[PDB]
Amino acid sequence: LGDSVVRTIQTGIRAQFANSGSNSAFKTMAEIGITQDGTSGKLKIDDDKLTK
């Protein structure tokens, strides 16, 4: 509970979605229809938007 270990481990994962190595038209997964639960953080998907 409250250990810096878990916070570091998880936050390092969380922040990577910037991906400072690509000039692609997309910048995050929202453009491809992936959203995150701001209340908690679990991700969610949209089938039709993802398909197109």
Partner: peptide, 21 residues
């Protein structure tokens, strides 16, 4: 610890800044 975490995020931002287009 908190200062360090924020600085690391700042470095991530700086790296993001480098993309060509």
């Amino acid at each position: 610890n908190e200062i360090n975490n924020n600085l690391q995020r700042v470095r991530e931002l700086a790296v993001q800044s480098a993309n060509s287009t």
